[PDB]
Amino acid sequence: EVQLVETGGGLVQPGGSLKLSCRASGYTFSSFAMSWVRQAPGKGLEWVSLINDRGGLTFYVDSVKGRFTISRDNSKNTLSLQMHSLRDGDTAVYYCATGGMSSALQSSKYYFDFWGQGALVTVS
Amino acid sequence: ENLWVTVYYGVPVWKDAETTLFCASHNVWATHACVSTDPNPQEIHLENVTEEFNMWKNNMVEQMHEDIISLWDQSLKPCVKLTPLCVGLQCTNVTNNITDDMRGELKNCSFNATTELRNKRQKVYSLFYRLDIVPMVDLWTNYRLISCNTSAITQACPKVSFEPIPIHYCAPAGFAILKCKDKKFNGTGPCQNVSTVQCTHGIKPVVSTQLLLNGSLAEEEVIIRSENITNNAKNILVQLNTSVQINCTRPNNNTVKSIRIGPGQAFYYTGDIIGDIRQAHCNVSKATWNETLGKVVKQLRKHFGNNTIIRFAQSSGGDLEVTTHSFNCGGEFFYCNTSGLFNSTWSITLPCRIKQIINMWQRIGQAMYAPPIQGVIRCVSNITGLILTRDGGSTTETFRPGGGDMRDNWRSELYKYKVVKIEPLGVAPTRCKRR
Amino acid sequence: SLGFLGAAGSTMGAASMTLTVQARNLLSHWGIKQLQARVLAVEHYLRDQQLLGIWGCSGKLICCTNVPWNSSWSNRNLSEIWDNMTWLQWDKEISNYTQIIYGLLEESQNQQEKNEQDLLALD
Amino acid sequence: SLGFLGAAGSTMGAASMTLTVQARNLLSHWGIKQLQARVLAVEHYLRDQQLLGIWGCSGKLICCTNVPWNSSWSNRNLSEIWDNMTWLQWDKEISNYTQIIYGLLEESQNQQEKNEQDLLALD
Amino acid sequence: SLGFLGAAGSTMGAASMTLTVQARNLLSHWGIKQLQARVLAVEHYLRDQQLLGIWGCSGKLICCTNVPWNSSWSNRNLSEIWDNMTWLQWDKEISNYTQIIYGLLEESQNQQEKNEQDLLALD
Ligand SMILES: *[C@@H]1O[C@H](CO)[C@@H](O[C@@H]2O[C@H](CO)[C@@H](O[C@@H]3O[C@H](CO[C@H]4O[C@H](CO)[C@@H](O)[C@H](O)[C@@H]4O)[C@@H](O)[C@H](O[C@H]4O[C@H](CO)[C@@H](O)[C@H](O)[C@@H]4O)[C@@H]3O)[C@H](O)[C@H]2NC(C)=O)[C@H](O)[C@H]1NC(C)=O
Ligand SMILES: *[C@@H]1O[C@H](CO)[C@@H](O[C@@H]2O[C@H](CO)[C@@H](O)[C@H](O)[C@H]2NC(C)=O)[C@H](O)[C@H]1NC(C)=O
Ligand SMILES: *[C@@H]1O[C@H](CO)[C@@H](O[C@@H]2O[C@H](CO)[C@@H](O)[C@H](O)[C@H]2NC(C)=O)[C@H](O)[C@H]1NC(C)=O
Ligand SMILES: *[C@@H]1O[C@H](CO)[C@@H](O[C@@H]2O[C@H](CO)[C@@H](O)[C@H](O)[C@H]2NC(C)=O)[C@H](O)[C@H]1NC(C)=O
Ligand SMILES: *[C@@H]1O[C@H](CO)[C@@H](O)[C@H](O)[C@H]1NC(C)=O
Ligand SMILES: *[C@@H]1O[C@H](CO)[C@@H](O)[C@H](O)[C@H]1NC(C)=O
Ligand SMILES: *[C@@H]1O[C@H](CO)[C@@H](O)[C@H](O)[C@H]1NC(C)=O
Ligand SMILES: *[C@@H]1O[C@H](CO)[C@@H](O)[C@H](O)[C@H]1NC(C)=O
Ligand SMILES: *[C@@H]1O[C@H](CO)[C@@H](O)[C@H](O)[C@H]1NC(C)=O
Ligand SMILES: *[C@@H]1O[C@H](CO)[C@@H](O)[C@H](O)[C@H]1NC(C)=O
Ligand SMILES: *[C@@H]1O[C@H](CO)[C@@H](O)[C@H](O)[C@H]1NC(C)=O
Ligand SMILES: *[C@@H]1O[C@H](CO)[C@@H](O)[C@H](O)[C@H]1NC(C)=O
Ligand SMILES: *[C@@H]1O[C@H](CO)[C@@H](O)[C@H](O)[C@H]1NC(C)=O
Ligand SMILES: *[C@@H]1O[C@H](CO)[C@@H](O)[C@H](O)[C@H]1NC(C)=O
Ligand SMILES: *[C@@H]1O[C@H](CO)[C@@H](O)[C@H](O)[C@H]1NC(C)=O
Ligand SMILES: *[C@@H]1O[C@H](CO)[C@@H](O)[C@H](O)[C@H]1NC(C)=O
Ligand SMILES: *[C@@H]1O[C@H](CO)[C@@H](O)[C@H](O)[C@H]1NC(C)=O
Ligand SMILES: *[C@@H]1O[C@H](CO)[C@@H](O)[C@H](O)[C@H]1NC(C)=O
Ligand SMILES: *[C@@H]1O[C@H](CO)[C@@H](O)[C@H](O)[C@H]1NC(C)=O
Ligand SMILES: *[C@@H]1O[C@H](CO)[C@@H](O)[C@H](O)[C@H]1NC(C)=O
Ligand SMILES: *[C@@H]1O[C@H](CO)[C@@H](O)[C@H](O)[C@H]1NC(C)=O
Ligand SMILES: *[C@@H]1O[C@H](CO)[C@@H](O)[C@H](O)[C@H]1NC(C)=O
């Protein structure tokens, strides 16, 4: 069994910031890439960010590239996302997911293997 | 998977190789030849690495052998030659008190030697061992030195010690030495507790026959090592797990005199003996030796049969250098009779002879004169292993002391080390491609 | 942190992170034996560095190339090669093909340098 | 222009423009002494070139890295270091931290090289 | 393909495809003579590699710089140099000008390194 549980916050006013934190268990955290994917309440899924297994490399969608920071702590087995300058268009459920990248010596993925419960982030 | 070749430099792999090793460490060895030793014991254990060893195909033995012979010759080359002393000797019986076992062993010889000046002669009296002289018929002489009919006799340089000191054989960069840290290691085949060292622990170039002195002990049990235990022509190296202390002595108090035999030359000889003349001997504790051989036969039965009788016997014959236990003690060369140790079926005093003119190896055409050492000599040494030979002769195997091939002496040590060449390059499939 | 060759018994993946640990250990009458040993150490180092230069891998320890793996040199997947094998076992497994691979790497660089030159000749 | 060590007494910001002058003069029984002298010069050269390779600085005389400067190693400002100090004074001032810096440089390249591999492994 | 010097009589263009063939054959009292031969071969190799490094051409067999060609060195067009001519004839022609070109290559790389350092210092 693999679990990903988001412990992030809720409502923040426009222009503020919110940090999300995903607790991962049931697998070796340092062996997988991690990402954040969001779904607006009435829309489909949207990929937001991707971080490598070691944490050295991060990738973002252009719409958040200068606003969101993705980081990992492989000693605590946690994934964090710090979202700055939140906009009304960022209201969505944010899902923590395992997969999306392989560190060169692993077989290819380019898909997401595990999804978390999902935190609901809203902007006034 | 659309995999691509990725080149890795610094890959932890190696291949078996033979290269030239250098040594590290008033003496034959480590004068200027060896590099100062790095005091840090930088030994790295290699977990999960199994390495195949073969102590009888180890080129470190051949290099150690050649290095010891070369250093020996370099040490003796710049020394006084005794060719002016190849004259007939007038020898009579020694007039001191001679014990029953010393009758005819030592003779009081006189000769006309050269002096500092070419046109002068001097009459010199000295005591020579019977082994160092042979009968000759001449006018006013009886004997001549044993080697003057074969090769020039070179006198060892005085104050240059023959004491063995540890020598570390160290690999050049790009190579590594692997050590087998395996208790009860067979000496051949796979070794699982392999570790990497820069160089060896410091191996003493101890020269001996039959009994291995001042070596390394087995970690737990006596280890029987042989290239092919079935083939009786091979020697068996027995590494003991406990030392047997052997106390060897020459009780006579020698008074040593010297003469000049040319400009800047000097010859050393025994002038006289203070006290009674007694035979040199070695004392091996009887109880310890009996337990040691009990352990050796216990180990031999694993290869020769649980219900076989093992017999020990003395050497079969041949030259003194291989039929007796040869060793250096105090600078003197002892040739001890080991028939008192290997005479059995499953305090011991071994008489010893002293020989001043010796041939250090089987090679013929070189000889060295060991100068006498003033005073009384007593050495305490550890017997750490045996060299045994199995009788060709059916049940009841018979074992005898082995010979003096020297490689055996330098296989008791260096059986746990292998030299490997590092191959820093390697390739492997990855998902990584250029651009 | 395991020291020179400490990763020799580790998997290829784990061992790939210790290349610098041992790379530094390739450079560092009786005078002739030691002097020849030093010269040989230099010659082996330089032959390996020259070979990396020929392949376009100079100055790098993990060099990616444009030569595909043909699945005949070894048909093991990346999981088995990197997580369930050591470098000694891999070196033995593809020893018979290393000269083929090296030749292809040389040819690949020869084409790449010409391509770079041609790209650099465009205004 | 100034000579082999002509800039030795000049400030760091001036002497840094003569790096090729010093670099070109690092390579160039009595035979044993002469050969040991030549082999030692070669060994020292290769040790420095290997060390530059480990850091990802091969083929460069001025190599910029990603290691941040620690104010505990030297608290002088950049203008004071490059305009009012020579390289000999700096070498003395930073001697006790040189090996620390070298270790970090090695670690930096080890992370960077793996990161480059992962960037190259994206399709 | 053609051997160690098989391209020696071929035109400059054709011989530019065999650079690895010649490059891979540069590294490979009787003891003193053998050691002097090995040390001299190593020193020549290292001096040429150092010189390429100074020019910014480390790790390459074909390297393009920013030094313009001066018609006073040779006014022959490309169809007279890369075809209808061998490298031996070219070396005979570019003899008196080799040190001038090398000096310009060194100066050009020094400027390139300073410019790269300044560009990389921009935040
Ligand atoms: C196996 O290993 C043991 C040692 O582990 C060897 O036994 C040693 O042998 C050496 C060489 O024979 C002995 O060294 C000699 O000791 C003599 C007595 O030393 C005593 O007195 C001095 C006074 O200063 C004390 O420092 C010392 O501790 C002792 O109390 C010395 O007189 C000798 O020096 C004379 O001879 C040498 C010859 O080389 C000259 O250079 C000197 O100038 C001087 O004339 C010498 O130092 C050593 O003592 C023995 N050890 C023990 C514990 O007894 C075995 O020989 C060895 N076995 C084999 C087969 O190799
Ligand atoms: C060896 O023989 C010589 C010659 O006889 C002995 O030396 C002489 O010994 C007597 C005493 O017996 C002295 O009076 C002489 O002066 C000695 N002569 C010389 C030339 O030294 C010598 O003592 C004998 N040695 C032994 C051990 O018997
Ligand atoms: C070591 O000592 C033994 C015992 O003294 C010698 O063995 C004797 O050898 C002679 C040879 O002719 C035999 O006739 C005797 O019968 C043997 N004695 C015994 C008790 O077996 C042996 O030769 C000596 N060896 C050396 C090398 O000196
Ligand atoms: C050695 O120091 C002297 C000064 O003592 C340098 O010469 C001049 O120093 C002043 C200091 O304000 C500068 O403004 C001048 O530009 C310097 N002269 C030149 C020609 O540059 C001298 O240059 C120093 N020597 C070296 C080799 O750096
Ligand atoms: C010398 O001793 C030997 C011992 O066997 C004896 O045979 C010989 O006769 C003795 N000679 C003299 C002259 O005393
Ligand atoms: C003299 O030398 C010859 C040849 O080495 C040898 O056969 C002979 O036995 C030697 N002489 C004696 C008395 O042993
Ligand atoms: C003999 O063995 C004992 C074992 O305790 C050791 O202490 C001693 O140093 C050894 N002696 C020699 C000469 O190797
Ligand atoms: C171990 O040694 C014995 C002799 O002692 C030999 O016969 C055997 O082949 C060796 N190798 C192994 C793997 O037992
Ligand atoms: C050991 O020697 C015997 C002699 O008969 C031979 O048959 C056997 O094959 C040899 N074994 C090895 C391992 O060399
Ligand atoms: C050897 O043992 C005998 C037993 O009588 C003793 O007299 C002698 O002194 C001992 N010698 C040594 C060197 O231990
Ligand atoms: C001592 O040696 C004899 C030799 O026959 C043997 O029978 C006896 O068992 C040995 N004793 C020991 C090792 O205690
Ligand atoms: C061997 O021991 C027996 C007594 O067990 C003895 O009679 C015989 O003389 C001894 N042999 C040797 C060579 O010491
Ligand atoms: C030998 O005798 C001489 C006589 O002067 C004495 O000085 C010396 O100490 C004695 N040596 C021994 C080892 O008994
Ligand atoms: C050796 O194997 C064990 C298997 O559990 C592994 O944990 C250990 O890390 C390995 N050693 C090395 C040096 O890789
Ligand atoms: C790799 O191949 C082995 C069989 O050789 C197979 O058991 C394993 O599951 C494969 N792994 C992957 C990731 O395809
Ligand atoms: C600088 O060195 C100190 C030494 O205590 C260390 O604590 C600090 O983290 C280092 N800072 C950087 C930026 O390397
Ligand atoms: C650098 O430090 C010195 C210390 O005396 C100070 O005078 C100088 O103004 C400083 N320069 C800068 C640019 O901060
Ligand atoms: C380096 O350490 C020594 C330790 O004694 C100290 O004296 C010296 O001043 C230190 N050097 C620097 C440049 O800090
Ligand atoms: C030599 O010249 C001929 C034309 O005369 C040409 O075909 C041939 O390829 C040339 N050889 C080489 C090695 O370039
Ligand atoms: C070309 O070389 C000549 C040599 O006299 C020189 O005068 C001229 O200025 C050089 N031209 C260029 C563009 O470097
Ligand atoms: C190159 O120069 C030669 C000089 O004879 C001329 O014949 C040729 O046409 C020129 N080539 C080009 C491409 O301009
Ligand atoms: C180089 O200079 C010498 C001076 O004697 C001259 O003869 C030679 O032709 C010149 N070389 C070239 C290629 O112009």
Residue numbers in the entry:
A (entry chain I): 1 to 52, 52A, 53 to 82, 82A, 82B, 82C, 83 to 100, 100A, ...
B (entry chain A): 32 to 56, 66 to 141, 150 to 309, 311 to 395, 413 to 459, 463 to 504
C (entry chain B), D (entry chain F), E (entry chain E): 519 to 546, 570 to 664
Pull text from the paper.
We found that adjuvanted protein or mRNA-LNP immunization of rhesus macaques with ApexGT6, an Env trimer engineered to bind Apex bnAb precursors, consistently induced Apex bnAb-related precursors with long HCDR3s bearing bnAb-like sequence motifs. Cryo-electron microscopy revealed that elicited Apex bnAb-related HCDR3s possessed structures combining elements of several prototype Apex bnAbs. The primary hurdle to eliciting Apex bnAbs is believed to be the low frequency of bnAb-precursor B cells possessing a long (≥ 24 amino acid [aa]) and acidic HCDR3 that can penetrate the glycan shield and bind to the positively charged surface within the Apex epitopic region. We designed a slightly improved germline-targeting trimer, ApexGT6, with affinity for additional PCT64- and PG9-class precursors, and we evaluated B cell responses to this trimer delivered as an adjuvanted soluble protein or mRNA-encoded membrane-anchored protein in RMs.
The RM017 liganded structure showed the expected 1:1 stoichiometry and a tilted angle of approach relative to the 3-fold axis, similar to other Apex bnAbs and their inferred germlines. From a top-down view, RM017 used its extended long HCDR3 to bind to the center of the ApexGT6 apex, similar to PCT64 LMCA binding to ApexGT2 (18), but with flipped heavy and light chains. The HCDR3 of RM017 approaches at a similar angle as the HCDR3 of PCT64 LMCA, with both forming beta hairpin conformations to penetrate the trimer apex, though HCDR3 of PCT64 LMCA penetrates deeper into the ectodomain surface. In contrast, the flipped chain orientation of RM017 shows the light chain making peptidic interactions with outer-facing C-strand residues of protomer A, whereas HCDR2 and HFRW3 work together to stabilize the N160A glycans. Beyond its central Apex interactions through the protruding HCDR3, RM017 also interacts favorably with the engineered V2b loop of ApexGT6. RM017 has a 17-amino-acid LCDR1, similar to DH650 (macaque CD4bs mAb, IGVk2), which may represent a light chain feature in macaques. In the cryo-EM structures, we observed a dependency on the engineered V2b loop, where several germline targeting mutations are located.
